[PDB]
Ligand binder design. Structure first.
Ligand SMILES: O=[N+]([O-])c1ccc2nn[nH]c2c1
Length: 301
């Protein structure tokens, strides 16, 4: 067996996933590789705020429907996001200056997207990139205008929109247990859960430099100590694609009982935003790279 999704499921995890979108599925060998080797897809761009709600209350789902329908057509799980973050955020939103207006805009955005696909989506990334590197909360428009309540409200709204989905907060630079940001998200998530915020998961966005895989072995169990039902690895790529870095990340998930799976940022190196760092698991000829084969070896029993 050569599918890393099949192999990780045979170790008891839920999926090995990949980010994609209509533009990828219509070209190259992406669809064929995803069908063969991955068990879950995420929309890279098509579910982000600027794509789905380019003006207030005016929604569009052309790309998102394409991806969701492709996943259902091909028997793949779906993760989607990000509902509330500063990236891909239209200026019409970040121009809002008052709490109630932004709350209602945010709630309508969450509810409309999640209701459209109710029951079909495994995981929603509800809040993203909410932390500064020092562990304080990032002064995005949601924090600046709503205040700290925005995170409780976002999660409570998402739970109502689709109670079947696993609701995640996600961030990057959570890759060392000694880094302030990693410690802060754990402390805040534990506080938020004790306050009744339904945070089901922490997702670690792992855009890694060479050699950073080893730190994840202790960072991931730190993240899991916040008490969420789940943790996951998102947006994974590694500059140089060292088998060692990738195997370390996989082993971290294997060693964390609440880690449900791993999502890689793309399929083939030339299509990565970081293509020249050759950071993915397939080369430009769509052949599996040494890191892919090292994952296969690590997961086979
Ligand atoms: O894991 N992912 O590659 C991924 C990509 C885009 C997203 N938007 N929200 N969550 C996401 C996860």
């Amino acid at each position: 067996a050569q599918s890393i999704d099949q192999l990780i499921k045979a170790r008891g995890k839920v999926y090995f996933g990949v980010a994609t979108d209509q533009n990828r599925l219509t070209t190259g060998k992406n669809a064929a590789i995803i069908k063969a080797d991955f068990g879950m897809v995420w929309p890279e761009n098509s579910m982000q705020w600027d794509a789905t709600e380019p003006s207030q209350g005016n929604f569009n789902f052309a790309g998102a429907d394409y991806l969701v329908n492709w996943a259902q057509q091909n028997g793949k799980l779906i993760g989607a996001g990000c509902l509330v973050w500063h990236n891909f955020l239209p200026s019409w939103v970040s121009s809002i200056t008052d709490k109630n207006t932004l709350i209602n805009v945010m709630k309508n955005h969450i509810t409309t997207l999640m209701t459209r696909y109710k029951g079909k989506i495994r995981t929603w990334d509800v809040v993203g990139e909410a932390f500064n590197e020092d562990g304080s909360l990032r002064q995005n428009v949601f924090l600046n205008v709503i205040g700290e309540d925005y995170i409780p409200i976002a999660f409570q709204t998402a739970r109502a929109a689709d109670p079947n989905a696993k609701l995640y907060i996600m961030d990057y630079n959570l890759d060392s247990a000694s880094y302030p940001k990693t410690q802060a998200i754990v402390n805040r998530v534990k506080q938020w859960r004790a306050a009744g915020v339904p945070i089901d998961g922490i997702g670690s966005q792992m855009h890694l430099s060479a050699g950073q895989g080893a730190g994840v072995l202790q960072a991931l169990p730190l993240l899991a100590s916040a008490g969420t039902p789940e943790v996951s690895i998102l947006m994974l790529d590694v500059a140089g694609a060292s088998p060692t870095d990738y195997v370390n990340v996989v082993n971290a998930c294997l060693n964390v009982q609440s880690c449900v799976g791993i999502t890689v940022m793309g399929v083939a190196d030339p299509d990565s935003a970081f293509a020249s760092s050759t950071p993915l698991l397939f080369d430009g000829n769509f052949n599996p790279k040494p890191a892919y084969n090292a994952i296969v070896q690590d997961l086979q029993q």
